[PDB]
Design an enzyme around this catalytic site. Structure first.
Site, PDB file in Angstrom:
ATOM      1  N   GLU A   1      39.099  17.849  47.003  1.00 47.20           N
ATOM      2  CA  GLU A   1      38.405  18.575  48.006  1.00 47.20           C
ATOM      3  C   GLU A   1      38.739  20.251  47.802  1.00 47.20           C
ATOM      4  OE1 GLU A   1      36.384  18.485  50.048  1.00 47.20           O
ATOM      5  OE2 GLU A   1      36.391  16.283  50.356  1.00 47.20           O
TER       6      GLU A   1
ATOM      7  N   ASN B   1      27.711  26.494  52.118  1.00 41.15           N
ATOM      8  CA  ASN B   1      26.847  25.250  52.032  1.00 41.15           C
ATOM      9  C   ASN B   1      25.479  26.175  52.375  1.00 41.15           C
ATOM     10  OD1 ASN B   1      28.443  22.768  51.525  1.00 41.15           O
ATOM     11  ND2 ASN B   1      29.113  23.315  53.379  1.00 41.15           N
TER      12      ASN B   1
ATOM     13  N   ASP C   1      22.374  24.957  55.211  1.00 37.53           N
ATOM     14  CA  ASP C   1      22.944  24.845  56.463  1.00 37.53           C
ATOM     15  C   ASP C   1      23.734  25.718  57.009  1.00 37.53           C
ATOM     16  OD1 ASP C   1      25.513  24.051  56.060  1.00 37.53           O
ATOM     17  OD2 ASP C   1      25.687  22.152  57.440  1.00 37.53           O
TER      18      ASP C   1
ATOM     19  N   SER D   1      26.959  26.697  56.528  1.00 38.70           N
ATOM     20  CA  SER D   1      28.190  26.017  57.179  1.00 38.70           C
ATOM     21  C   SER D   1      28.963  26.182  55.932  1.00 38.70           C
ATOM     22  CB  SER D   1      28.080  24.593  57.563  1.00 38.70           C
ATOM     23  OG  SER D   1      28.203  23.644  56.689  1.00 38.70           O
TER      24      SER D   1
ATOM     25  N   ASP E   1      33.208  25.178  54.518  1.00 39.23           N
ATOM     26  CA  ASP E   1      34.140  24.226  54.275  1.00 39.23           C
ATOM     27  C   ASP E   1      35.593  25.179  54.101  1.00 39.23           C
ATOM     28  OD1 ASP E   1      32.386  22.023  54.546  1.00 39.23           O
ATOM     29  OD2 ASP E   1      32.220  22.260  52.231  1.00 39.23           O
TER      30      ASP E   1
ATOM     31  N   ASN F   1      34.843  21.362  57.734  1.00 35.43           N
ATOM     32  CA  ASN F   1      33.459  21.975  57.905  1.00 35.43           C
ATOM     33  C   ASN F   1      33.120  22.702  59.226  1.00 35.43           C
ATOM     34  OD1 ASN F   1      30.268  21.546  58.583  1.00 35.43           O
ATOM     35  ND2 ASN F   1      30.599  22.260  56.383  1.00 35.43           N
TER      36      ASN F   1
HETATM   37  C1  LIG Z   1      25.994  20.062  51.153  1.00 32.49           C
HETATM   38  C2  LIG Z   1      27.455  19.225  51.573  1.00 32.49           C
HETATM   39  O1  LIG Z   1      27.333  18.058  51.620  1.00 32.49           O
HETATM   40  N1  LIG Z   1      28.453  19.866  51.914  1.00 32.49           N
HETATM   41  C3  LIG Z   1      29.889  19.077  52.055  1.00 32.49           C
HETATM   42  C4  LIG Z   1      30.077  19.178  53.597  1.00 32.49           C
HETATM   43  O2  LIG Z   1      28.933  18.594  54.447  1.00 32.49           O
HETATM   44  C5  LIG Z   1      31.420  18.198  53.877  1.00 32.49           C
HETATM   45  O3  LIG Z   1      31.908  18.226  55.217  1.00 32.49           O
HETATM   46  C6  LIG Z   1      31.258  17.129  56.214  1.00 32.49           C
HETATM   47  O4  LIG Z   1      30.106  17.632  56.769  1.00 32.49           O
HETATM   48  C7  LIG Z   1      29.371  16.395  57.316  1.00 32.49           C
HETATM   49  C8  LIG Z   1      28.213  16.620  57.663  1.00 32.49           C
HETATM   50  O5  LIG Z   1      27.952  17.425  58.624  1.00 32.49           O
HETATM   51  C9  LIG Z   1      30.312  15.992  58.465  1.00 32.49           C
HETATM   52  O6  LIG Z   1      29.908  14.648  59.015  1.00 32.49           O
HETATM   53  C10 LIG Z   1      29.654  14.651  60.365  1.00 32.49           C
HETATM   54  O7  LIG Z   1      30.646  14.556  61.037  1.00 32.49           O
HETATM   55  C11 LIG Z   1      30.104  14.833  62.552  1.00 32.49           C
HETATM   56  C12 LIG Z   1      31.711  14.693  63.303  1.00 32.49           C
HETATM   57  O8  LIG Z   1      32.528  13.647  63.155  1.00 32.49           O
HETATM   58  C13 LIG Z   1      29.423  13.609  63.053  1.00 32.49           C
HETATM   59  O9  LIG Z   1      29.035  13.495  64.356  1.00 32.49           O
HETATM   60  C14 LIG Z   1      29.895  12.649  65.180  1.00 32.49           C
HETATM   61  O10 LIG Z   1      28.960  11.533  64.974  1.00 32.49           O
HETATM   62  C15 LIG Z   1      29.484  10.231  65.749  1.00 32.49           C
HETATM   63  C16 LIG Z   1      28.488   9.102  65.348  1.00 32.49           C
HETATM   64  O11 LIG Z   1      27.412   9.637  65.111  1.00 32.49           O
HETATM   65  C17 LIG Z   1      29.333  10.643  67.170  1.00 32.49           C
HETATM   66  O12 LIG Z   1      29.749   9.467  67.957  1.00 32.49           O
HETATM   67  C18 LIG Z   1      30.305  11.921  67.432  1.00 32.49           C
HETATM   68  O13 LIG Z   1      29.686  12.317  68.725  1.00 32.49           O
HETATM   69  C19 LIG Z   1      29.776  13.229  66.427  1.00 32.49           C
HETATM   70  N2  LIG Z   1      30.871  14.055  66.651  1.00 32.49           N
HETATM   71  C20 LIG Z   1      31.046  15.239  67.018  1.00 32.49           C
HETATM   72  C21 LIG Z   1      32.154  16.207  67.103  1.00 32.49           C
HETATM   73  O14 LIG Z   1      29.841  15.786  67.508  1.00 32.49           O
HETATM   74  C22 LIG Z   1      28.115  13.650  62.165  1.00 32.49           C
HETATM   75  O15 LIG Z   1      27.222  12.488  62.295  1.00 32.49           O
HETATM   76  C23 LIG Z   1      28.398  13.634  60.464  1.00 32.49           C
HETATM   77  N3  LIG Z   1      27.370  13.791  59.844  1.00 32.49           N
HETATM   78  C24 LIG Z   1      27.312  12.764  58.555  1.00 32.49           C
HETATM   79  C25 LIG Z   1      25.888  13.303  57.978  1.00 32.49           C
HETATM   80  O16 LIG Z   1      28.030  12.162  58.180  1.00 32.49           O
HETATM   81  C26 LIG Z   1      31.801  15.832  58.167  1.00 32.49           C
HETATM   82  O17 LIG Z   1      32.882  15.735  59.084  1.00 32.49           O
HETATM   83  C27 LIG Z   1      32.282  16.836  57.342  1.00 32.49           C
HETATM   84  N4  LIG Z   1      33.720  16.783  56.770  1.00 32.49           N
HETATM   85  C28 LIG Z   1      34.694  17.513  57.291  1.00 32.49           C
HETATM   86  C29 LIG Z   1      36.195  17.189  56.540  1.00 32.49           C
HETATM   87  O18 LIG Z   1      34.643  18.523  57.728  1.00 32.49           O
HETATM   88  C30 LIG Z   1      32.459  18.919  53.287  1.00 32.49           C
HETATM   89  C31 LIG Z   1      33.731  18.017  53.408  1.00 32.49           C
HETATM   90  O19 LIG Z   1      33.420  16.679  53.031  1.00 32.49           O
HETATM   91  O20 LIG Z   1      32.326  18.918  51.658  1.00 32.49           O
HETATM   92  C32 LIG Z   1      31.066  19.509  51.462  1.00 32.49           C
HETATM   93  O21 LIG Z   1      30.847  18.912  50.059  1.00 32.49           O
HETATM   94  C1  LIG Z   2      39.112  18.470  38.543  1.00 38.40           C
HETATM   95  C2  LIG Z   2      39.381  18.723  40.183  1.00 38.40           C
HETATM   96  O1  LIG Z   2      40.429  18.462  40.702  1.00 38.40           O
HETATM   97  N1  LIG Z   2      38.498  19.708  40.620  1.00 38.40           N
HETATM   98  C3  LIG Z   2      38.927  20.660  41.919  1.00 38.40           C
HETATM   99  C4  LIG Z   2      37.479  20.540  42.555  1.00 38.40           C
HETATM  100  O2  LIG Z   2      37.420  19.135  43.001  1.00 38.40           O
HETATM  101  C5  LIG Z   2      37.274  21.347  43.722  1.00 38.40           C
HETATM  102  O3  LIG Z   2      35.932  21.659  43.981  1.00 38.40           O
HETATM  103  C6  LIG Z   2      35.277  20.684  45.102  1.00 38.40           C
HETATM  104  O4  LIG Z   2      34.884  19.783  44.381  1.00 38.40           O
HETATM  105  C7  LIG Z   2      34.480  18.581  45.125  1.00 38.40           C
HETATM  106  C8  LIG Z   2      34.044  17.240  44.735  1.00 38.40           C
HETATM  107  O5  LIG Z   2      35.217  17.001  43.637  1.00 38.40           O
HETATM  108  C9  LIG Z   2      33.359  19.239  46.065  1.00 38.40           C
HETATM  109  O6  LIG Z   2      32.872  18.096  47.108  1.00 38.40           O
HETATM  110  C10 LIG Z   2      33.677  20.410  46.839  1.00 38.40           C
HETATM  111  O7  LIG Z   2      32.518  21.058  47.275  1.00 38.40           O
HETATM  112  C11 LIG Z   2      34.334  21.373  45.952  1.00 38.40           C
HETATM  113  N2  LIG Z   2      34.970  22.419  46.839  1.00 38.40           N
HETATM  114  C12 LIG Z   2      34.987  23.793  46.652  1.00 38.40           C
HETATM  115  C13 LIG Z   2      35.878  24.639  47.317  1.00 38.40           C
HETATM  116  O8  LIG Z   2      34.048  24.086  45.741  1.00 38.40           O
HETATM  117  C14 LIG Z   2      37.808  22.771  43.288  1.00 38.40           C
HETATM  118  C15 LIG Z   2      38.044  23.826  44.530  1.00 38.40           C
HETATM  119  O9  LIG Z   2      39.173  24.481  44.918  1.00 38.40           O
HETATM  120  O10 LIG Z   2      39.187  22.720  42.757  1.00 38.40           O
HETATM  121  C16 LIG Z   2      39.301  21.774  41.537  1.00 38.40           C
HETATM  122  O11 LIG Z   2      40.428  21.996  40.921  1.00 38.40           O
END
Ligand SMILES: CC(=O)N[C@@H]1[C@@H](O)[C@H](O[C@@H]2O[C@H](CO)[C@@H](O[C@@H]3O[C@H](CO)[C@@H](O[C@@H]4O[C@H](CO)[C@@H](O)[C@H](O)[C@H]4NC(C)=O)[C@H](O)[C@H]3NC(C)=O)[C@H](O)[C@H]2NC(C)=O)[C@@H](CO)O[C@H]1O
Ligand SMILES: CC(=O)N[C@@H]1[C@@H](O)[C@H](O[C@@H]2O[C@H](CO)[C@@H](O)[C@H](O)[C@H]2NC(C)=O)[C@@H](CO)O[C@H]1O
Ligand code: NA
Length: 130
Positions: A35, A46, A49, A51, A53, A60
């Site tokens: 991550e 992102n 959206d 948003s 991270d 997120n």
């Molecule tokens: C562009 C892209 O992909 N960027 C990545 C980020 O999206 C990603 O962060 C993760 O984002 C997802 C999508 O928004 C999020 O998942 C959502 O989680 C919420 C909260 O748990 C869910 O809502 C819950 O749903 C349940 C069941 O439907 C309900 O019972 C509950 O009431 C809800 N909770 C709340 C608090 O309202 C969403 O349904 C769910 N959406 C999806 C599509 O799965 C993740 O939690 C994000 N993860 C984190 C760690 O924050 C980021 C990290 O993976 O990475 C980018 O790449």
């Molecule tokens: C080789 C490796 O460890 N790469 C690291 C990256 O993974 C990381 O980037 C993150 O990549 C994820 C998938 O592997 C994505 O979901 C995520 O969006 C992305 N995170 C960011 C902040 O861009 C980067 C980030 O510090 O570190 C690399 O070392």
């Protein structure tokens, strides 16, 4: 701050992440490596959206912390997102524990799903003595 692998492993162990919600420390370490590369300053905007991270676990803003600029977001961790860009990761850990307790569990983390799932992750903890 960019943590060294074993330094983070020790920290996470101490903060009781090993076995939390049944997730092994190795899984948590794998997750942190892909991550953010163990970087507390990591941020990912992102454009499709508005948003963001934040920090080591890339929590997120749509759901978990308040950054004041994510449309229609909530703050389930009850933290400013700014608190996730700190050297001390206690807040980030408490939030990661909240995140994993949602229905989705560890699937909330995309990098985890792509690079850690269905793999032997013992390497992220080797030689750390945890
Ligand atoms: C562009 C892209 O992909 N960027 C990545 C980020 O999206 C990603 O962060 C993760 O984002 C997802 C999508 O928004 C999020 O998942 C959502 O989680 C919420 C909260 O748990 C869910 O809502 C819950 O749903 C349940 C069941 O439907 C309900 O019972 C509950 O009431 C809800 N909770 C709340 C608090 O309202 C969403 O349904 C769910 N959406 C999806 C599509 O799965 C993740 O939690 C994000 N993860 C984190 C760690 O924050 C980021 C990290 O993976 O990475 C980018 O790449
Ligand atoms: C080789 C490796 O460890 N790469 C690291 C990256 O993974 C990381 O980037 C993150 O990549 C994820 C998938 O592997 C994505 O979901 C995520 O969006 C992305 N995170 C960011 C902040 O861009 C980067 C980030 O510090 O570190 C690399 O070392
Ligand atoms: Na928010």
């Amino acid at each position: 701050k960019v943590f060294e692998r074993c330094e983070l492993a020790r920290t996470l162990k101490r903060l009781g992440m090993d076995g939390y919600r049944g997730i092994s420390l190795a899984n948590w370490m794998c997750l942190a490596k892909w991550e953010s590369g163990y970087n507390t300053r990591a941020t990912n905007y992102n454009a499709g959206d508005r948003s963001t991270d934040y920090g080591i676990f890339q929590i997120n803003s749509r759901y978990w912390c308040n950054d004041g600029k994510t449309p229609g977001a909530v703050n389930a961790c009850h933290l400013s997102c700014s608190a996730l860009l700190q050297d001390n990761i206690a807040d980030a850990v408490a939030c990661a524990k909240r995140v994993v307790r949602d229905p989705q569990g560890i699937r909330a983390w995309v990098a985890w799903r792509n690079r850690c799932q269905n793999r032997d992750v013992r390497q992220y903890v080797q030689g750390c003595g945890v």
